[PDB]
């Protein structure tokens, strides 16, 4: 019968580090090595926490590190060996048909524009993103994009974007180990408030060691905004790759279980009943496989 395993946990690919923040001045960003870090301070209004850029600074320095793992098809925990073999065969056919081509282009795009600067990008007049391919502690291949030219809603083509995309595809395929140091620069303004992640003093903000920072899962969610193949209406753009296409901002879920568009039914009939879905839909399925999960029946 080859039913779905009762445990099918997947470890996540595309590991994001906690994105630090730092204060800097534009046209001096080429020496961004000992800039001061944005610190969350306590100001009573009731006591609240706020984080704002210093007076003699106009650029944010959100920096994080990304590991591209590979082996997205292999589950960390499984019960049925036949189901694992069938799923691995299905992922092998997906890889042979296309070798992580389109998904890597979308991930390279989402790295190109500083969408991981969630609320630090809408109010910034100039956003610059620098991406390095560090190898053995040294930068092997350096990139430098401008986030304004690369929109949040279109997925175009570019030579540097193609190079970053083939690097991401090589990482996701398992042909090599890919380590990316992503540094983003945004002209948020002089003394304007920044928006780090919020912790649960009515409201408090995230920090790691005397420095405001963004949660790793926020950066991962921003990197998962590659889903454009849902039944879009009212002109919504790319959404974060989630099971049942859930978007908290809209408060509603696309790819409902009533339609044949959620991740679970397509995974099932793709590996159980051999009904391969559309190429875009199978891209969505492999995206859910890359992000990991606690999938499996009960």
């Amino acid at each position: 019968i080859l039913s779905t395993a009762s445990v099918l946990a997947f470890e996540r690919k595309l590991d994001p580090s906690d994105a630090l923040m730092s204060a800097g001045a534009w046209a001096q960003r080429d020496a961004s090595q000992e800039w001061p870090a944005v610190t969350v301070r306590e100001k009573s209004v009731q006591t609240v926490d706020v984080a704002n850029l210093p007076s003699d600074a106009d650029t944010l320095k959100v920096r994080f590190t990304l590991r591209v793992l590979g082996g997205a098809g292999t589950p960390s925990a499984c019960n049925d060996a036949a189901y694992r073999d069938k799923l691995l065969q299905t992922v092998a056919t997906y890889v042979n048909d296309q070798g992580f081509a389109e998904l890597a282009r979308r991930y390279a795009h989402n790295l190109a524009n500083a969408r991981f600067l969630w609320r630090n990008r809408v109010g910034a007049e100039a956003v610059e993103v620098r991406i390095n391919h560090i190898r053995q502690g040294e930068v092997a291949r350096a990139w430098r994009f401008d986030a304004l030219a690369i929109g949040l809603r279109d997925f175009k083509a570019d030579a540097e974007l193609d190079a970053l995309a083939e690097l991401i595809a090589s990482g996701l395929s398992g042909s090599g180990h890919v380590l990316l140091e992503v540094v983003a620069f945004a002209r948020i303004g002089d003394g304007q408030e920044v928006f780090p992640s919020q912790e649960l003093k009515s409201k408090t903000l995230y920090s790691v060691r005397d420095a405001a920072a963004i949660h790793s899962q926020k950066i991962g969610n921003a990197l998962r905004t590659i889903d454009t193949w849902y039944p879009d209406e009212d002109g919504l753009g790319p959404i974060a790759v989630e099971p049942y296409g859930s978007v908290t901002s809209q408060g509603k879920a696309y790819r409902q279980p009533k339609q044949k568009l959620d991740f679970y039914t397509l995974l099932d009939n793709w590996v159980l009943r051999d009904e391969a879905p559309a190429v875009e839909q199978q891209h969505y399925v492999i995206a859910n496989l890359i992000r990991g999960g606690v999938f499996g029946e009960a």
Partner: protein, 187 residues
């Protein structure tokens, strides 16, 4: 004043439209401060008075030269991913006119206690007895939360649309686009 530019809010998978409205309103305030002029009118085409909703569409009213001066200003950078920009078309002739006004409130009694300290030199208990804590003003009006470059405190600015008239006379406009006696057409 005969022209208008319409801004629609693209739905956003990361942000509700309220803070997007606040960000764009701050950007247009900065653009009008840099540009100058007193003939820029704001409008909420889909303002809902049942639940004090701001709406999902924006209409800015100006002349042709004012509109091209506004769109020539580079404030539009960094916000195209969430808005529509139509064309500076002429407003329809048979349109009722209404006014927009910023209605502030004395919601904090301690501000006025500090004020009367600087005006009448009263003590703490005198201001406490003179001003109770129930004098806070609650407004069932749509609002936007912004912080200023001059003073970093976050201030809430209420926007209210006046009654529909049949004609409009010449009036002024503030830096926020709110009318100090002017009117904007409704359509």
């Amino acid at each position: 004043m005969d022209h208008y530019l319409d801004i629609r809010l693209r739905p956003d998978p990361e942000f509700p439209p309220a803070q997007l409205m606040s960000v764009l309103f701050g950007k247009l305030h900065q653009a009008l401060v840099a540009q100058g002029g007193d003939r820029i009118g704001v409008s909420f085409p889909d303002l809902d008075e049942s639940r004090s909703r701001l709406g999902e569409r924006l209409r800015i009213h100006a002349s042709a030269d004012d509109l091209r001066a506004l769109l020539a200003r580079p404030w539009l950078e960094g916000l195209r991913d969430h808005l529509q920009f139509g064309e500076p078309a002429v407003v329809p002739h048979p349109t009722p006119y209404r006014q927009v006004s910023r209605v502030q409130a004395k919601s904090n009694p301690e501000r006025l206690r500090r004020r009367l300290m600087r005006r009448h030199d009263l003590s703490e208990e005198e201001a406490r007895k003179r001003i109770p804590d129930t004098v806070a003003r609650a407004l069932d009006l749509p609002f936007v939360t912004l912080r200023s470059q001059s003073t970093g405190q976050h201030f809430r600015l209420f926007i209210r649309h006046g009654p529909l008239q049949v004609t409009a006379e010449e009036g002024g406009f503030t830096c926020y686009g709110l009318s100090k006696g002017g009117f904007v057409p409704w359509f």
